[model samples]
Target: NASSQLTLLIGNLIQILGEKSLTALTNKITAWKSQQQARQQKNLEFSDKINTLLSETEGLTRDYEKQINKLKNADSKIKDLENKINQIQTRLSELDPESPEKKKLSREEIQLTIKKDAAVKDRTLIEQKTLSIHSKLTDKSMQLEKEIDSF
Candidate 1:
């Protein structure tokens, strides 16, 4: 008896709402679902971009470390050359200025000086490259993190 009564109530609602209005309500729900799907698509696209930037950041960090290691190597090479040049200078001082040995030592000293200067130039160039990316690693795509997580 209760089930029959419920069927009667449902029939009354179907007549009161009408088929066209019911179709309109169903279309509204479809539009709503479409909007949700569109929003989801955009969210996925945005997250993809975020991951792209993050991977680039990590890749660049590896490059920066490699560049820094090269820079340190260049610095150490220059220092080694400097010490060798100083030792040659000391040897030159111990001998008479006009002596053949002094002249030989002077030639080697000049060569080492040139080598050290070139190393310094190398280090400077690498440092410039390192500076160019300093701004890159600082951000790490941090601004979009909150938005991504919120979604």
Candidate 2:
């Protein structure tokens, strides 16, 4: 009888152990599922951040290209103005100081000289504006890039 009782007790203990093992396995699976969901959510958040950064960088690059084009145009204008001034200076240098041509100044000649001077002055002004604009554009682009990188 004692042997039978001991056998029954051992069987009950084995069943209890099996139930505990099943409960632990179920809990582990549940925890793993929760972790996977959390990981997916995190990945989605990171993807969104990357997309935002990419868009901002693209916009900044486009703006920088525009500024570069504008800078090039300004440089061209400055070069043309410089060439015109040089031509005027060369012509003026060729004029005879004591010639009647110098003494008999026509109204049209005077007006032309005045217009040329004005154009040279205007070109200088535009050069300054171009410099200022380029400086600001560079700074802005750098800042935007840094911000995107940090993001």
For candidate 1, what is the TM-score?
A: 0.72
lDDT winner among the candidates? 1
Clash count, predicted structure 2:
0
Point to the candidate with the largest TM-score. Answer: 1
Total backbone collisions, model 1: 0
Per-candidate Cα lDDT values, in order, are 0.78, 0.63
lDDT by residue (1-151, candidate 1, tens digit) is: 6445644655576688875756655566557667777888988988798888778888989989998898888889988998998888888888975876777777898899998888899889999888877667766656467556766
Which residues of candidate 1, in runs, are more than 4 Å off?
1-16, 19-31, 139-151
Error of 1 at 114 (Å): 0.9
Kindly list the per-residue Cα lDDT of model 2 for residues 1-46, writing each as its tens digit. Answer: 5445644655576587765656655566557667767877867866
In candidate 2, where is summed lDDT lowest over 10 consecutive residues? 102-111
Cα deviation of 28, candidate 2, in Å:
2.8
